[PDB]
């Protein structure tokens, strides 16, 4: 046992995945990011924060400041929150 | 809808700027950079977003003042 | 009423203080929740949660 | 119990599979990674002890009693990983021989080294020849299970 | 061998855009004329700005805007460097070198500046 | 999506010019030409992927470099392209690489 | 009569199944964080190693938190006062019973014990006739598949 | 110490670390687009990387207007390279300004020309020395005076870093050298 | 803090309508629950290499000290526990390699090493310097090598350091090279890959280290050693 990994073999693979352009996000392209928000909001009235994070590949706190800018939030159950640009 | 929100946001900024002067749809399309949104959407705008709009102000044959209606 | 320590001389049994009279340990539980329900009244008192 | 019961139980019914919760909010590309685990033949070493140095050595039931050890032996099992992904990979299989825990041996049973030695050898190990065995040694104390 | 590759490319493109020509209602003669034309074409101061004390540390603008030299369009796999020593691992690849056109799927590579 | 870059090439440029003639004669539309250029991209990428298998090796002096929008742009001087059966030297070459 | 094998078998099944759950939880935690898996790290050896060690030493049985109401006192320190106490101790068997006041027929000497359990050889104390001792020739089946 | 001035082998400077603020906001993308012999990967890091061969150096410039210059053989040469980059930025037309230039670190190295016993050094200076031959092959010495870090090798090679002033390197080295001579093989 | 409670009288114990007898139990010490969670990880790690409880008790102790100072709270808690385990093992005079503690953990060698130094800085404390002797025992043991050969290797190792034949080498690698020389001088002859496999170092590292000590092999063996293959017949690789 323990045929020494010194750098764990899965962990190496995960770092390798990371070793292909990660850890930097658009934020920065604001307007183009707004375009993604407008496009997404066209598909459905409300979305989970997690779906927007996958969809726009940007820091969450910045996206929150945008959702404060053009929308509101609507929570239900156990902290299950969805955001919406107040359709009317 | 998203496009319409950009109209709302522009209008919001203009109200915030201090002015509520009405403009044509075409100008609004231009200023929102949504000129090429197509006839269909424009038509949707004309026959819902602009007329089924619960708080749209029509004045001088043009559409103004969207964000607010409760206080003047 | 909280019974005096002579009723709960713990038992030490080596160590030091490793000896809280398990009744004391229950008394510690009562004080803890009563402190919390008190703070609950001080703070954002709910309804069902107070119940 | 060792020769039958423990093997039957690890073979009986414990295959476990896990399918990741991926492709959320966005998908369309064959990818929710899935893994399955299977357990084969069980192995059981002779009663062993690991000295603080890290060096294993054979344990003598008399020594186990003086130093207050637990006279037990290591149990090992064959574990398999079997990755039948949702498409591309299906033949990713790898074999392992792994330590899972320490089973207390009972004295002079077929798995406790005293069974093989002769009367002169057993006297050499400071063990009684007439002593009957059939009781576990735990933490220095000799312990017998009541039917 | 390589003019044949371009011929391969001509067959693939003409074949695959033919349907586009038909979808518009454009005549196949135009498609052939395109092919034929295309074939014919084929062959104080010091605490603020002491900065002006390094004037002319400049070089030739000559090497980029003019493109008098030859050009290569390809792709990169990985680029790696060690001080002034540079290493390149490239892939895919069309070259144009003093009159002739060449091709590669992989190209590896070392240069110093 | 296949890179527009190969449209810059002589091959790509002769095509764009061939399309431009067709537009001069108003036999086709600009959008259709773009659709032909997009198909040409795919098809030449495919030709690269399936047919092209050869490789080359090179050494030279680096003159300038750039990197932006995941696009590498070089200009090398005194370059030497070396192959197993041929060799190709040129005084200066630009190398643009995307991935 | 449950003996050392079927008594151990109940515990080994429970800890090993319990071990299977702890490995299930580990593989999900691996998949959640962004993947970093080591099959050798997921096995919590202590579940088995220490679990058998514990039950057999105290004499308790199983879950300790709750299961210990009736099947208590099943392991014991092997009495060693003479040679006979030990042979007699290893060859002891116990009927479970209520405790502190029961009077009925599981205390008298049923005829079917003939050739099976000792006529006279039972504690002179409170548990008279409840802890019995196996006759001299008697034997016990280990059991096997009827197939 | 005159008595030992063959201590005075004056350790060679190899690297200098300085920063400077250009005094204006910039656009790295345009910069990366426009500038020659420069690299910019916003998907990997924020700063644009530029490199000259002059006094052979390299600089990394941010968008806030702050930048860091490295690679210099000396502090004057470092002020020269820093000024050369800011000149280039001036040549871009951008409001380049030579503001807040400051050295952050100096690095020196040297050889003593004799083998030594690290086992003794780590024993006698146990409170400050830290040696892990299984991990790093050198020995790490943390002085509390000219708060400097030293790298000691069996060959006798030494590197010093954490410096703010060249005098501090000489002082650190003049102080420690007799001890090292006292642990010669 | 407090006692616990749990289900079982059959019931009445409301859930009145839902399926939850009486009430749920309550967490108590949450700020520290990951200290307790650290103690759980240290014992797992500890058993996977069969460490004594005395090591675990030192390890747990070091950790509490590092935790209370809150000087390195930013770091990976599991990295901190692993480094504590390494220190405890070295202080008790039976060091494990960084390679060994990494093996029973999910933390990288670099990060354990880094945390190691920081803890040393945090507690303002120092440890002894590892010797060849501290590892010669475990390795020769796991390779089923005779006691006599283990003794010779020890002597080979000790002398090798005494003659200063390896100034540019780690003691572990030298230990490995001594084990190989011994084993090839006996009937056992463990292969380089096998020694590599127990030691964890690269087998090229052993080969180089062997090539460096080979010129003085006659002088390094104990005079009382029972030779099998003489040094005049000792292989080269």
């Amino acid at each position: 046992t323990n045929y020494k990994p010194v750098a764990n073999h899965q962990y190496n693979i995960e770092y390798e995945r990371k070793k292909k352009e990660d850890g930097k996000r658009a934020r920065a392209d604001k307007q183009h990011v707004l375009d993604m928000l407008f496009s997404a909001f066209e598909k459905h009235q409300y979305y989970n924060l997690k779906d927007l994070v996958d969809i726009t590949k940007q820091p969450v706190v910045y996206l929150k400041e945008i959702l404060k800018e053009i929308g509101v939030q609507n929570v239900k159950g156990i902290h299950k929150n969805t955001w919406e640009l107040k359709p009317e | 809808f998203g496009v319409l929100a950009k109209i709302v946001n522009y209008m919001k900024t203009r109200h915030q700027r201090g002015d509520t002067h009405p403009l044509t749809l075409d100008e609004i399309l231009d200023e929102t950079q949504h000129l090429d949104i197509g006839l269909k959407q424009k038509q949707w705008l004309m026959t819902e977003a602009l007329v089924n709009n619960p708080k749209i102000e029509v004045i001088d044959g043009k559409y103004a003042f969207k964000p607010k209606y409760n206080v003047r | 009423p909280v019974p005096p320590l002579s009723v709960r001389p713990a038992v030490v049994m080596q160590g030091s203080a490793r000896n809280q009279d398990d009744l004391t340990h229950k008394l510690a539980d009562i004080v803890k929740i009563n402190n919390q329900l008190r703070r609950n009244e001080q703070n954002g008192a709910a309804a069902h949660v107070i119940a | 119990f060792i020769q039958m019961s423990v093997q039957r139980i690890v073979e009986d019914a414990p295959p476990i599979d896990l399918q990741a919760e991926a492709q959320h909010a966005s998908g369309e590309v064959e990818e929710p990674p899935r893994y399955l685990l299977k357990f084969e033949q069980i192995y059981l070493s002779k009663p062993t002890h690991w000295e603080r140095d890290g060096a294993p050595s054979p344990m003598m039931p008399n020594e186990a009693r003086l130093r207050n050890l637990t006279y037990s032996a290591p149990l090992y099992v064959d574990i398999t990983k079997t990755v039948i992904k949702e498409g591309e990979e299906q033949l990713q299989t790898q074999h392992q021989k792994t330590f899972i825990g320490k089973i207390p041996i009972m004295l002079r049973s077929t798995y406790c080294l005293l069974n093989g030695l002769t009367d002169r050898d057993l006297c050499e190990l400071n063990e009684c020849p007439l002593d009957p065995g059939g009781y576990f040694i735990i933490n220095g104390s000799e312990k017998v299970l009541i039917a | 061998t390589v003019p044949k590759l371009y011929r391969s490319v001509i067959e693939d493109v003409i074949n695959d855009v033919r349907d586009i020509f038909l979808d518009d209602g454009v005549d196949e003669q135009v498609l052939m004329e395109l092919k034929t034309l295309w074939e014919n074409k084929l062959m104080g101061q010091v605490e603020e700005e002491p900065l002006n004390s390094e004037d002319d540390v400049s070089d030739e603008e000559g090497q980029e805007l003019f493109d008098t030299e030859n050009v290569v369009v390809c792709q990169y796999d990985k680029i790696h460097r060690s001080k002034n020593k540079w290493k390149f691992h490239l892939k895919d690849g069309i070259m144009n070198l003093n009159g002739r056109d060449y091709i590669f799927s992989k190209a590896i590579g070392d240069a110093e500046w | 999506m296949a890179y527009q870059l190969y449209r810059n090439t002589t091959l790509g440029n002769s095509l764009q010019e061939s399309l431009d003639e067709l537009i001069q004669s108003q036999q086709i539309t600009p959008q259709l030409a773009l659709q032909v250029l997009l198909q040409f991209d795919k098809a030449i990428n495919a030709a690269l992927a399936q047919r092209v298998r050869n490789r080359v090796n090179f050494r030279g002096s680096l003159n300038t470099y750039r990197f932006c929008d995941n696009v590498w742009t070089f200009v090398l001087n005194d370059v030497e392209f070396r192959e197993v059966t041929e060799l190709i030297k040129v005084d200066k070459v630009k190398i643009v690489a995307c991935d | 009569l449950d003996l050392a094998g079927p008594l151990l078998a109940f515990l080994f099944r429970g800890m090993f199944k319990n071990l299977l759950k702890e490995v299930r939880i580990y593989a999900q935690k691996f998949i959640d964080r962004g993947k970093d898996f080591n099959l050798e790290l997921a096995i919590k050896t202590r579940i088995i190693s220490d679990g058998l060690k514990y039950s057999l030493a105290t004499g308790n049985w199983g879950d300790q938190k709750k299961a210990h109401q009736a099947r208590a006192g099943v392991s014991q320190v092997l009495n060693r006062l003479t040679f006979a106490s030990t042979l007699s101790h290893l060859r002891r068997l116990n009927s479970p019973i209520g405790r502190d006041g029961k009077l009925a027929k599981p205390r008298q000497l049923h005829n079917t014990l003939w050739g099976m359990v000792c006529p006279a050889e039972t504690p002179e104390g409170h548990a008279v006739g409840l802890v019995k001792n196996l006759a001299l020739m008697a034997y016990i089946s280990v059991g096997s598949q009827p197939s | 110490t005159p008595a030992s001035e063959s201590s005075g082998i004056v350790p060679q400077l190899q690297n200098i670390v300085s920063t400077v603020n250009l005094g204006c906001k910039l656009d790295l993308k345009t910069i990366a687009l426009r500038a020659r012999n420069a690299e910019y990967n916003p998907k990997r890091f924020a700063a644009v990387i530029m490199r000259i061969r002059e006094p052979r150096t390299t600089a990394l410039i941010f968008s806030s207007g702050k930048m860091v210059c490295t690679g210099a053989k000396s502090e004057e040469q470092s002020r020269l390279a820093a000024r050369k980059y800011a000149r280039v930025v001036q040549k871009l037309g951008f409001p380049a300004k030579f503001l807040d230039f400051k050295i952050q670190n100096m690095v020196g190295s040297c050889d003593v020309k004799f083998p030594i016993r690290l086992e003794g050094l780590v024993l006698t200076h146990q409170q400050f020395s830290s040696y892990e031959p299984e991990l790093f092959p050198g020995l790490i010495y943390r002085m509390i005076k000219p708060r400097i870090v030293l790298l000691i090798f069996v060959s006798g090679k030494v590197v010093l870093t954490g410096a703010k002033v060249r005098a501090e390197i000489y002082e650190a080295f003049e102080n420690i050298y007799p001890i090292l001579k006292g642990f010669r093989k | 803090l407090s006692t616990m409670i749990g289900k079982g009288t059959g019931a009445a114990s409301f859930d009145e309508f839902g399926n939850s007898k009486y009430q749920n139990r309550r967490t108590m010490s949450s700020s520290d629950r990951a200290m307790m969670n650290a103690f759980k990880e240290i014992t797992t790690m500890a058993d996977r290499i069969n460490l004594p409880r005395n090591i675990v008790d030192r390890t747990n102790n070091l950790f509490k000290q590092v935790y209370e100072q809150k000087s390195l709270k930013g770091r990976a808690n599991d990295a901190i526990a692993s480094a504590c385990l390494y220190i405890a093992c070295r202080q008790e005079g039976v060091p494990r390699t960084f390679k060994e503690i990494c093996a029973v953990s999910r933390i990288s060698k670099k990060e354990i090493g880094r945390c190691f130094k920081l803890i040393l800085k945090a507690l303002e404390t120092s440890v002894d310097l590892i010797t060849t002797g501290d590892f010669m025992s475990r390795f020769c043991s796991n390779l089923c090598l005779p006691k006599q050969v283990q003794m010779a290797a020890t002597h080979i190792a000790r002398k090798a350091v005494e003659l200063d034949l390896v100034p540019g080498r780690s003691p572990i690698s030298v230990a490995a090279a001594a084990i190989y020389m011994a084993s090839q001088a006996s009937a056992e002859k463990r292969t380089q890959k096998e020694i590599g496999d127990i030691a964890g170092v690269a087998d090229v590292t052993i080969r180089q280290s062997y090539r460096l000590i080979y010129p003085r092999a006659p002088d390094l063996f104990p005079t009382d050693f029972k030779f099998d293959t003489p040094v005049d017949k000792l292989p080269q690789l």
Side-chain angles (χ1 to χ4, degrees), chain G:
Chain G
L1 296 176
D2 286 309
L3 254 66
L7 283 171
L8 283 168
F10 173 87
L11 294 179
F12 187 83
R13 186 190 83 243
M15 293 160 195
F16 180 68
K17 295 289 196 195
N18 175 297
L19 176 61
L20 198 69
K21 177 212 194 171
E22 282 289 291
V23 168
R24 252 220 67 247
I25 285 175
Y26 194 94
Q28 195 177 315
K29 284 186 174 189
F30 133 51
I31 291 183
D32 207 83
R33 297 170 190 184
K35 301 192 296 188
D36 176 50
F37 188 76
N38 185 325
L39 176 62
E40 302 196 355
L41 302 184
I43 300 288
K44 305 291 175 59
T45 47
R46 296 207 73 180
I47 288 169
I48 303 177
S49 308
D50 300 314
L52 282 189
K53 172 193 189 186
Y54 179 80
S55 301
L56 220 170
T58 59
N60 294 320
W61 203 254
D63 196 27
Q64 178 67 67
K65 290 177 290 286
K66 179 181 177 67
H68 61 65
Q69 60 285 353
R71 294 180 180 169
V74 168
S75 189
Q76 302 183 354
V77 196
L78 168 70
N79 176 289
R80 308 283 289 225
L81 188 68
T82 38
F83 191 67
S85 313
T86 306
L87 290 181
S88 174
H89 210 147
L90 283 157
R91 150 173 308 271
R92 204 157 293 144
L93 51 135
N94 173 52
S95 202
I97 200 57
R99 291 270 110 76
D100 282 20
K102 186 173 292 303
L103 63 95
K105 74 171 65 194
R107 277 191 189 268
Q108 72 173 26
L109 178 66
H110 196 269
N111 310 60
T112 53
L113 298 188
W114 176 276
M116 304 307 174
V117 169
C118 197
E121 186 161 343
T122 198
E124 65 180 353
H126 196 49
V128 56
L130 302 162
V131 183
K132 301 170 193 179
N133 188 90
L134 206 67
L136 192 48
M137 96 202 300
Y139 205 89
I140 296 177
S141 71
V142 291
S144 71
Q145 299 188 157
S147 316

Side-chain angles (χ1 to χ4, degrees), chain E residues 46-61 63-64 81 83-84 86 113, chain H residues 36-37 39 49 51-53 56 79-81 83-84 86-88 90-91 96-99:
Chain E
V46 299
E47 78 171 336
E48 288 185 351
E49 54 187 336
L51 292 183
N52 266 84
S53 305
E54 302 237 359
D55 230 332
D56 254 23
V57 289
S58 305
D59 58 330
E60 194 200 344
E61 183 81 14
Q63 287 158 13
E64 291 192 344
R81 71 186 203 250
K83 298 183 189 287
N84 69 333
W86 289 79
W113 178 74
Chain H
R36 282 193 300 272
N37 291 278
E39 297 171 334
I49 306 157
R51 296 171 178 279
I52 61 165
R53 299 183 296 192
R56 190 67 184 80
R79 183 161 63 188
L80 184 180
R83 180 174 58 235
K84 197 159 173 177
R87 170 87 196 153
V88 171
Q90 206 178 59
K91 189 178 186 287
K97 297 190 182 185
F98 188 76
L99 308 178

Side-chain angles (χ1 to χ4, degrees), chain A residues 3-46:
Chain A
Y3 198 11
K4 335 204 102 27
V6 311
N8 210 316
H9 180 213
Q10 187 67 12
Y11 188 70
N12 200 312
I13 295 164
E14 168 65 18
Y15 180 40
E16 187 172 3
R17 192 183 65 68
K18 192 187 184 183
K19 290 182 293 183
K20 189 39 175 168
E21 247 176 337
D22 298 330
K24 294 292 160 186
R25 296 180 181 287
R27 198 177 60 176
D29 217 14
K30 194 176 176 79
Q31 171 78 324
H32 198 253
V33 149
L34 187 61
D35 206 74
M36 313 181 181
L37 300 175
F38 276 167
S39 295
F41 183 78
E42 202 61 24
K43 185 170 167 183
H44 196 33
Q45 289 81 3
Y46 55 91

Side-chain angles (χ1 to χ4, degrees), chain H residues 144-177:
Chain H
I144 58 102
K145 238 41 228 332
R147 295 185 68 177
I148 314 294
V149 181
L150 308 89
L151 279 57
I152 317 303
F153 295 73
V154 298
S155 62
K157 282 298 189 76
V158 180
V159 192
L160 306 93
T161 178
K164 301 301 188 188
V165 180
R166 66 171 59 243
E168 298 160 4
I169 305 186
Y170 304 115
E171 186 169 311
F173 188 76
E174 183 158 20
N175 195 274
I176 211 176
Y177 168 80

